[PDB]
Amino acid sequence: HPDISVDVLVIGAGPTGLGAAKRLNQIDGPSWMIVDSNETPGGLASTDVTPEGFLYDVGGHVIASHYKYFDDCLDEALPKEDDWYTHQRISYVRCQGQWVPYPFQNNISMLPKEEQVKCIDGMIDAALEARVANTKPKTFDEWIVRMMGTGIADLFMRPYNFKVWAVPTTKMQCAWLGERVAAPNLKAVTTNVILGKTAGNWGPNATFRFPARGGTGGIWIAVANTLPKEKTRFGEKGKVTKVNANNKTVTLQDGTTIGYKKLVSTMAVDFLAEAMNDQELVGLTKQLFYSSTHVIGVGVRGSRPERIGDKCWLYFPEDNCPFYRATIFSNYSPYNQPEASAALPTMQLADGSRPQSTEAKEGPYWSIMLEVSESSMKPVNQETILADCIQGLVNTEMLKPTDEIVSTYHRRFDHGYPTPTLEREGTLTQILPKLQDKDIWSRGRFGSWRYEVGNQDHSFMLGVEAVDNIVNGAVELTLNYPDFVNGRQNTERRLVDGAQVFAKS
Amino acid sequence: HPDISVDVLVIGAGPTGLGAAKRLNQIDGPSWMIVDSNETPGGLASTDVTPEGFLYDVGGHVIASHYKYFDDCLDEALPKEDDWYTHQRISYVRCQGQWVPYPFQNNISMLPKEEQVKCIDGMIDAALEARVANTKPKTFDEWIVRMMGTGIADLFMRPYNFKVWAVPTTKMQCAWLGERVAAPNLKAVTTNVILGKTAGNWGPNATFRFPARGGTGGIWIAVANTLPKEKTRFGEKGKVTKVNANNKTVTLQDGTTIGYKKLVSTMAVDFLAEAMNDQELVGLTKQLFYSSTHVIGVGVRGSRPERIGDKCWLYFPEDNCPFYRATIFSNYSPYNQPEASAALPTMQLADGSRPQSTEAKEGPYWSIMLEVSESSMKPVNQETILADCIQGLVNTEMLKPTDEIVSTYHRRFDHGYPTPTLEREGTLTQILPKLQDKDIWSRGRFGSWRYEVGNQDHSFMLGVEAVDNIVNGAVELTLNYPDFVNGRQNTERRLVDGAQVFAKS
């Protein structure tokens, strides 16, 4: 007989696990507990801080919620207006010395006329081909070229997406992009070119909110704080080392055994297969592909440069920098970096030189957060990637040679992106139903490995819907139908449902 | 204060209302009750019997279930193998003296060669147009011609659907038919013509089960008998006469008032509007279109004629009979008509003659169930429709002039089919939200008025999902996404869910 017995055991307290726990808590029927090897919940949605007081998320995290249930829980966790800042969704592509507003194709009037000609000719071919197309594209690369044409594809989406996925676009599927037919809006693109118009896809109605304090990790700390503590086990004490699916027993690092009826596992499924000592599954999970993420943080002395302005995140297709995305993290909250009166010495100049003077000088400060991908098809030299990133900031005119860097951050995350390879779905249909047949709900960014439902809200709801399926027989829509959940406002499920209203009365 | 108060009130005990009742009874959380103006539950899924012992459903009723939950409840209601009979889904189209197997286009080798040429040429045109189509059809008629071509459309789907819907195909939408592209399978059609092949879309895998006793109506009597009797109020004592949405009170025939927190209403929504005394809603619901259904039943003396054989239902595009559909109801269960040793006099011969003898003679017996539509665009003479129907049986060679009729049946159902007109959605998206804002879930074949989810299983699940939405925040998938639920096996929701399992432990 195990040390602990619950109806539903949740493994992992990132957004997916916390989601399962929140729904389990709301329903308040079956017994449950949640474990995590980390003392701080949040997983890849956590936040680090440098010794100099600069916060960094695990790369650019911007919330775009598809669900009221997610909203309810974030509101409960951080109920004050002062707990959040709101920003418009401002992003640009760096291309040929210019900041081109996203979406790229609507803004190519910024490029030289000769480049515009190439882009439009390319898009005209794609329009004419789309007119007689009667097959769906089979790879990411095909989808891109059918949408954009060759010229526009080559300038942005093709090289950018290799830099992101660390695999060629020709090796990825394209179903994860949704149901929209791959064809250009030639009229829109030519119209902006003719008018000499630029326009970004943001405005007063395209916004996101970011926690005032603690970065994205502040959300999951606060969400986890609403749970009954005695149903949690976070830290070394909650590290899972063995899963015996046949016995329905989990063994923790310290020897504790937990017997479960149903298991919601949100750890990476390849980790799960190993903990299961299941050779068949280890074999299958090894067929999945993923990239690692290097997060580089740079803290900079000065008031925010005009050339930076209200930019939020930024895309880099070109090979004059190693990162694919930059985030002006200091724009997200004034509390992501020290107050202006905090005194810090200059660590280095952006040109790589180190000043002799160790004088601590005041701010204000701003902060850049960068991401570099790694895979078996794209190695990263860990010893030089910080300096290479900083030179990249100089090349892209984000930093002047003389800008004073007062803090640096670098951390490599092993499981960063689950890759939508051509083989992904075939491998998953062998893995997830096998786990299902053992009453294991493997869910989450790497729990179920689908990037198209791999954001914070998706992950949260993968956990919530897994519990809802377990308890109430609900359809796991986010898991099986990403296009369905992503194409609608999901408003039906709420932190207070009729069940709780009727019960209280 | 009202005579009775419940959390959830369900009006109507046809399949939709019984679905709501079943799910409420399973959840066993919020209080509830169900009412009906009829002492016998079933609604349009009920069964009548003639004084001579011939059963008739409300027209051809064949179960094609898309949900496990539905199956669960039917298995619970009628658990014995002896409670059901299984049959292949056998149907034909009556065309030019021939019984053409369904689907019609795959079987036109039974037509004159010169006619096959016109059909194939028509479909060739449709195939060539479909290759370069860049728009969806906007009407049912356009959908039909794009799928079949002019020649085949004119033989079956165009005149048949006018006879069913009592409105022209050009006046109806086609979104209700689902997301499949409107285009011909030219090779399938030419292949069967070249091979001289006939092929029906049935066999060992394509079957349905039909209740052994009491007709389709026996299902719903049995399902209702699983409910706690005291939460039911069926008969004149259960007839709703007034709905006060602002006070959340319902008034019954006998003066009884019921207070509710949430209302699931499964009566026709135009009747609901009347019972609410809501002028705006009455205005809107009057803009909805529907057809009435005449059901004609004919009991015939004799063993099953060879020409009839194992036929189940039959379509009639042509103008030599008033019915659009016939069902060989005696093929569905040997208990839909009297036993062979039951003695009955011949009422008339099929050509209308008097019988040579008026004394009771034994069987065996077989039985035909016919349907005739009526609308403001297609009147039906009630005084002569029985006689016209019987003449139709002769014209279509279903009866010989000498066949002996031993029982007749005629009944008119006012609300028969909810019509997918071009205007339907424009109207419903004005009605259903207004009811929703008053905590009224109006659901069902005429509760929510959508034929594409208008079968028994759809209706049951509309009730089930409305409750699940009320109590558990579930998405009402059947109501809002017909294509979703009809395109998948809906297996997640069960009559015993996790909630009930964990509760008992």
Next chain:
Amino acid sequence: HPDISVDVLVIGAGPTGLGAAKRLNQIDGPSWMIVDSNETPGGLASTDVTPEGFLYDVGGHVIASHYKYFDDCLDEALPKEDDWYTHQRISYVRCQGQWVPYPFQNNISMLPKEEQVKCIDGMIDAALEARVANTKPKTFDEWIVRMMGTGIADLFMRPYNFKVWAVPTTKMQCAWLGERVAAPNLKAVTTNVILGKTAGNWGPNATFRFPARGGTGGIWIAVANTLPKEKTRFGEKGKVTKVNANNKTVTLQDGTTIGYKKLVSTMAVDFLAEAMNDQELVGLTKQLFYSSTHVIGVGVRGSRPERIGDKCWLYFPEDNCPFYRATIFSNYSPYNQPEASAALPTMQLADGSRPQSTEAKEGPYWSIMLEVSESSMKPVNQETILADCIQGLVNTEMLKPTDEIVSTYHRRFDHGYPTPTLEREGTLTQILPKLQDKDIWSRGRFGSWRYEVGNQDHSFMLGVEAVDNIVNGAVELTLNYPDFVNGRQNTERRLVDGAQVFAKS
């Protein structure tokens, strides 16, 4: 017995008849004779001169030769290099205050940006339609809109062609335009728009030669002068008044009778039918459509204005002027107008004002030749057309209000354009075979009524080929296959053929 008898009689000494005569004279086999009612040969390719010394062709006459035989005869007639001037084929379209280089669609970068967007959107639509087109256009109007799209059609070719043909584009065929697929060159058009580029279809190799003296008329006088005079009868003494097809006799004005074996008639075929007193033929030729041509000439004091420059001819789609085409005739030869030292009084200013002085003043001078079309569907007030033309010159900014007019010219030509109506070929294929059966070769711009082979070189060659058919059994290629002769340089037939070479030896 007639007064004169020849093997081949040619009626008319315009280009077509002179072609017949040149070939007859070269062959020197059958006896022959050519007549004309005008003392001066040249027909519609003749030239008038005002009392003040300004020459005017019959509207813009620019030579574009498809035949070396035509070239040979022109070289023979006017052999000196001093006999000709060479110019680039410089043309513009007047649109919205701008001189837009031809071809119009390649130069819409000159238009307002909002208009460019509408133009490009229309041509995108045409490009996409053209990709799936499986039918030929059936009218001139369809041809135009399929080539240009709605926006560009509406700016130039649709209104301009009404002004030219004096019938709507919807009433004309399009076979006469050749074999080219009706489809846009979207890339060409978008590229110049993107580049902000203009480009006319002319250059050092896109030229024409014009006679130094006597206008276009000087060519045909010189060509006719190479013929044996005694075989020509030009003037009142050459006016044909009756053609007895049955007796192969022609009666002239003065009563001279001419017997022939074969007749080449180059007069208008409706006049020929009348001269034949052939009722059936009069009816048929009456079904042919044609427009009349008003030629207006304006002589202007001053050196060539900068705004005019090297412009040759000009197209006018808009309604602020009655003419469809303008020619800067002073640019074709310095001898089309008086020398600078010639003294002329100012007749009026361009705004209609009297001059300050009526004294004869010196030049230099320049000159504009205008064309206005007339038909039953487009009446022309002959009393006001000159004044309206001059106002149109001010409206289009060809003339300043202050420009001094020193000579005016106006002549109406009854048969100006033979119209490619939808009915043209139905009618011609009844007329030409009947004439042929009587050994009458009716040929020429109105002799056979086909505009697509209606220029000077076509006409000349129609005469030549008619003779070559009569004598040598040659195919009349220009007559029956416009696309054939227009799509090649016809090099085989020369003014000195093998026959004359072998004979001289």
Next chain:
Amino acid sequence: HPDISVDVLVIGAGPTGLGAAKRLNQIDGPSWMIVDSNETPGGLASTDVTPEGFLYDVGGHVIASHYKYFDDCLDEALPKEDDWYTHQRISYVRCQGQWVPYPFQNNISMLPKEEQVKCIDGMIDAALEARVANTKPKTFDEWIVRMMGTGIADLFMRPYNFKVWAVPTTKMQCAWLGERVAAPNLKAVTTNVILGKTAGNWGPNATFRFPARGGTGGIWIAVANTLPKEKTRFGEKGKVTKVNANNKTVTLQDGTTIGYKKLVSTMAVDFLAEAMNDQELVGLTKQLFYSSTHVIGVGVRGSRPERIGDKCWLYFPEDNCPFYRATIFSNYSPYNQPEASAALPTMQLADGSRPQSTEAKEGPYWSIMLEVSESSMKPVNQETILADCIQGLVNTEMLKPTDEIVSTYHRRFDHGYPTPTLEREGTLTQILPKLQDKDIWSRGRFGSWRYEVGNQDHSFMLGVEAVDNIVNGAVELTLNYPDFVNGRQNTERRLVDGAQVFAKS
């Protein structure tokens, strides 16, 4: 000074050279002379006779005249009604044990139904592709598949054409087939399949005439007889051995020298290059490709078998016979083989065995003429080809094993077909203009090497038009525009033109 000087010298007295001769003779202007190495005119349009009295043309020769001039000369040469037999153009394809009427695709209803399905499926694919096709086919093979689809292509046009051209279809151009769009008539093919219908492309209006006596060669002997004998030089005395293009002198085998001004050469252009000792031309003409033709004749004892009947020529795509075409040559004229009273011994039975009796026996007799192609890509065993052909006749059921063969014939013609390879035009546009500049008109089946104008009428007219271009400056239409002459009735040029009429008077 050469022995003989003429204005125009014609080398070769096949149809092309005779055409040149007839036109020169008609014009009666320049002096001329025609030479041939054979005593008998006709070339590949000649006829051999076996020692047993069986005539054979050089393979099946059936006249289909596009020209009135050709008709004129044939009528002059053979003026009597009994100089000719008229037959319908009856042809069949041998395929899977059956004679299928030509055109094959309209008659596939004769094939097994499953095979019809594959044929129609293939043609449906090709129709759908043709609906969106915007490129011309570039090879003969692409052309075939676009017209027929894969299934039908593989049954007839692909294997047959390899057997004809002795090169794969993928190695040939397709321009030579004309301007018709490469696309199936799906409706016509499926219609005959549906109706179970067969129809050949012949009847009372689809006929050919054949000379009563002497085979096809009788025509050209007769045409030659109309020429002034002293201007002909036929046999060893007329064999050209050397051409000196710079001196314009031809040397004959007997040493005779002929000076010319213009040369019409109708020998194979690769032979002409050799005779010119022009190494550049030798190299060029070696790039042309041709196949050799083996003609096999089989004379058979008996009245014409019913299984043969009225068949004229027959196509053989399959591998059970080496010949590609058979002609029932005894059907073309009763004088193509001996009268029934002629006594001949049986040489062998068709199964290869010796005859029972070696005695001369009476007829009647019938006769089969076969063609086998050979090239560097398709070698032929010349030692066994007669036996292989005879066995081929047994395999195809044209002959019974017991049929008595009384005569056999085999002759290999080295230049048989000029092959429309992909390279042909690139080579010919270097050859023919180079010869042209030297005043050499190289014309004819191998004179100018274009099979699409390679029949008797084409050839004849290539000669006629060469002369007409040399003397009258005519366009060489047949040479340069095959689609033009083939697509019309060429009626303008006659054996008596106006020139001869006007001169006689």
